[PDB]
């Protein structure tokens, strides 16, 4: 009888653990829904064509300043390639303004498919040894990772 | 100025140093971590970081300071808790509400805004003053006055001395003019952590320590300004001896610098000493926090901070000795310090020596210990003060072949060698009386002679009895007490009585909390007199038997005196010397009645 009641208590504990695990899994599922919605919004952001160019210029400036390399080779999606080709030397001028350095000899070819890119640029350096992945999908999942505690704090009830 | 190149553990190599002298403290990174130079190879210089090095970049700026490791002195240094790099811990805990110690905190070692009372020592305008002269006294707290002295590297004529009143360390309390130029002085005094403070001349100590514990104060004494070494044992040792040296010692102040020890033990010490109402004055119950100071650096603290903690502790000892007090510094460190040297030496890729310790371990331990000794102070008035170094050694689990142990015993004058076997048997003071020694037994001759002109002989007799018992213990372990004669039997009886009555002490009760010298010497004289009289009686051989028959006669028909002897340890010191002395004199008279009354009927 003692071991029967002990096994019954163990079964009750296992049921409680299963219930709490189901609750936690539903929480994670809601977080995944949040991530999917954020990805959809990020994809929708690519529809713009005027502030989108400014954002691309800012991204390329940030990446080139982070590498601080003599010769990068930027890679951009075939879609909106015209925007990158248009911004062109503006980024080089901005970088040369940032510090007293000769303008980088950028090179722009192969492009990854749209959904893989979803905006943003990959800059890298000659021989591809050092790679900077400033894709919009890459900026996301880092902001998400950092802000996740704030997300849980927002999910009080 | 300079920038980081390499970051491995706590060793950082920063290029661009060029003219960066050795041990010139540098500040590393945006977080501004303290740090001392340890090696140079050209434009780059190795640095010890004294803090966690996680998160250092490459080309992260490093700023030089041109100043070696320095501790800030002055009023309020007493009764505080400082990190190894001398950060006020309570100040950090209050100023920042966070309970943690944040990385790279920059807090002054001493508060620069507290108002302190100033009492100039009759120094007139146009007078001549010199290094270490004692121009003003400040009452840091009741029952502990703090004299203020000029730094040893200062001199000049007194153009302006501040009047008596409330002052803060930011104010200039004194002005001097020398060699055609003038200099100012505040109540602060920065001093390099190494390069010990100057002394007019050293002296040979004569006053004993007279600590609370009976074994230490009687068998293996230490002099004020002496040098000791206990094997850092727990339950005993690091706790009971520390308490005796802190709250029940004649040293005018205490400096506990135990670093590289357990955090729970440090918290217990730092929470128990706040109350600690020791009767240091004649009729006052002032807490010893107005008398001591902690330089605690736990084990988890950075490895490079151990040497800094030890040297700051000994430097603080020097400031007080210079004022005039007889400071006594206790270091639960020097067991973790050797480990710190091994860590830094190995990381610096130094060639190891015997047993892997750096070859210069003896040199460092000497440069630390040899800063002890009573010293005639600098400046006017004439004055005298001392520093005592009761350090720690590896626990009694390793033989004396340990390089740290051999290095200590090659320098230390008094060895309170605690034995683990006594700790198993729960003998709490735990000093092994066969292996301990005190080279100060010759200098204390005058004090022993003046206190009691017959103590030396009774001490030698007690030593002989203990040695004889330890000698024939091996023989008994083979044959047994069957062959033991009258002399051997009485010697073992007296040795057992001495071991359980004299050499033990509970220290958790008023019977053995603090045994004054008079009570201890009276116990010794009583026991030795009993031994001598019993030996004479058994040598008389009256009644045709004498001998062991007389021994049984005195152990049975005269055993009340024996019980009073073994219970003499319970004479309450609170009753006062005129009462305990009378009680012991009466017990001595009763003992003299025995072995004469026992000889009356010829056994």
């Amino acid at each position: 009888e003692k071991q029967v009641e002990i096994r019954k208590k163990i079964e009750y504990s296992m049921q409680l653990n299963a219930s709490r695990i189901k609750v936690l899994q539903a929480q994670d599922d809601l977080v995944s829904n949040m991530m999917e919605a954020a990805s959809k919004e990020v994809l929708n952001v690519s529809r713009d064509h005027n502030s989108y160019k400014k954002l691309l210029k800012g991204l390329i400036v940030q990446s080139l300043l982070r590498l601080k390399e003599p010769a990068v080779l930027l890679r951009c999606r075939k879609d909106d390639h015209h925007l990158v080709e248009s911004v062109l030397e503006s980024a080089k001028e901005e970088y040369a303004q940032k510090l007293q350095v000769h303008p980088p000899e950028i090179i722009v070819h192969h492009n990854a498919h749209g959904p893989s890119c979803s905006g943003g640029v990959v800059v890298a350096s000659r021989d591809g040894k050092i790679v900077c992945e400033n894709t919009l999908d890459a900026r996301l999942d880092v902001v998400f990772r950092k802000k996740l505690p704030e997300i849980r704090k927002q999910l009080v009830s | 100025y300079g920038y980081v190149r390499k970051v491995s553990g706590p060793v950082v190599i920063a290029d661009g140093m060029n003219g960066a002298a050795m041990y010139e403290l540098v500040r590393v990174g945006h977080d501004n971590l303290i740090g001392e130079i340890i090696r140079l190879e050209g434009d780059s210089a190795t640095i010890q970081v004294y803090e966690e090095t996680a998160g250092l970049m490459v080309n992260d700026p490093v700023l030089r300071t041109h100043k070696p490791l320095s501790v800030e002195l002055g009023p309020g240094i007493l009764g505080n808790i400082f990190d190894g790099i001398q950060r006020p811990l309570k100040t950090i805990a209050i100023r920042s509400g966070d309970v943690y110690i944040p990385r790279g905190v920059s807090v002054p070692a001493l508060d620069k805004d507290t108002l302190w009372e100033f009492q100039p020592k009759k120094i007139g305008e146009g007078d001549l003053l010199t290094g270490g002269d004692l121009y003003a006294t400040v009452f840091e707290n009741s029952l502990m006055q703090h004299h203020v002295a000029l730094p040893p590297d200062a001199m000049g004529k007194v153009t302006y001395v501040a009047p008596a009143g409330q002052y803060s360390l930011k104010d200039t309390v004194l002005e001097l003019e020398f060699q055609g130029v003038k200099k100012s002085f505040t109540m602060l005094q920065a001093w390099p952590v190494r390069t010990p403070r100057p002394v007019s001349s050293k002296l040979a100590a004569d006053t004993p320590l007279l600590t609370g514990q009976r074994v230490l104060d009687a068998l293996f004494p230490s002099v004020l300004g002496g040098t000791c070494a206990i094997p850092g044992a727990f339950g005993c040792g690091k706790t009971v001896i520390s308490q005796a040296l802190s709250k029940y010692s004649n040293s005018d102040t205490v400096v506990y610098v135990g670093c590289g020890e357990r955090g729970n033990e440090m918290a217990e010490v730092l929470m128990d000493f706040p109350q600690l109402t020791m009767t240091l004055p004649d009729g006052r119950e002032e807490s010893v926090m107005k008398r001591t100071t902690l330089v605690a650096n736990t084990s988890n603290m950075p490895v490079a901070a151990r040497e800094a903690s030890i040297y700051t502790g000994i430097t603080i000892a020097e400031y007080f000795r210079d004022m005039g007090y007889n400071v006594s510094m206790m270091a639960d460190s020097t067991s973790r310090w050797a480990e710190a040297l091994r860590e830094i030496s190995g990381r610096l890729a130094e060639m190891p020596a015997d047993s892997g310790y750096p070859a210069y371990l003896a040199a460092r331990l000497a440069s630390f210990y040899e800063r002890a000794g009573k010293v005639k102070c600098l400046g006017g008035p004439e004055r005298t003060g001392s520093v005592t170094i009761v350090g720690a050694v590896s626990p009694p689990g390793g033989d004396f072949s340990d390089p740290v142990t051999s290095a200590t015993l090659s320098i230390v004058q008094v060895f309170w060698g605690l034995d683990k076997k006594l700790a198993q048997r729960k003998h709490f003071p735990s000093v092994n009386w066969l292996i301990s020694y005190s080279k100060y037994s010759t200098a204390l001759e005058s004090f022993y002679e003046q206190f009691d002109p017959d103590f030396i002989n009774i001490r030698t007799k007690a030593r002989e009895v203990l040695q004889r018992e330890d000698d024939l213990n091996e023989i008994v372990q083979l044959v047994g007490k069957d062959a033991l004669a009258e002399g051997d039997k009485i010697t073992l009886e007296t040795a057992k009585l001495l071991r359980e009555d004299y050499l033990a002490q509970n220290a958790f009760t008023p019977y053995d909390k603090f045994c004054p010298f008079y009570k201890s010497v009276w116990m010794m004289r009583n026991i030795i007199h009993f031994y001598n009289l019993a030996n004479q009686a058994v040598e008389k051989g009256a009644g045709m038997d004498g001998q062991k028959i007389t021994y049984t006669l005195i152990k049975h028909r005269l055993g009340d005196l024996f019980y009073r002897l073994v219970s003499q340890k319970f004479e309450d010191p609170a009753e006062g010397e005129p009462a305990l002395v009378a009680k012991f004199k009466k017990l001595h008279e009763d003992l003299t009645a025995g072995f004469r009354a026992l000889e009356d009927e010829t056994r």
């Binding site: 009888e1 029967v4 009641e5 019954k8 079964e11 009750y12 049921q15 409680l16 219930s19 189901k22 609750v23 539903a26 929480q27 809601l30 829904n33 949040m34 919605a37 954020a38 919004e41 990020v42 952001v45 954002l55 800012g58 991204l59 400036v61 940030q62 300043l65 940032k98 919009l136 900026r139 996301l140 902001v143 998400f144 802000k147 997300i151 927002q154 999910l155 009080v156 009830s157 | -």
Partner: protein
């Protein structure tokens, strides 16, 4: 007595299981409601952080 005790234990276990299921359903409903309420603000904050560059 033993049969009654085991029957009562089985009934109590069933009641506890039902209570756990009801509490789980309530918790899932609460979490879904909160996520639906705060999703747009969360996504707006995320996009604002993603779509900004300094220098």
């Amino acid at each position: 007595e033993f049969q009654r005790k085991l029957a009562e234990s089985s009934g109590d276990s069933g009641a506890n299981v039902k209570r756990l299921e009801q509490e789980t359903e309530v918790k899932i409903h609460h979490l879904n409601a909160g996520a639906e309420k705060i999703q747009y603000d969360v996504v707006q904050m995320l996009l604002k952080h993603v779509t900004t560059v300094k220098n």
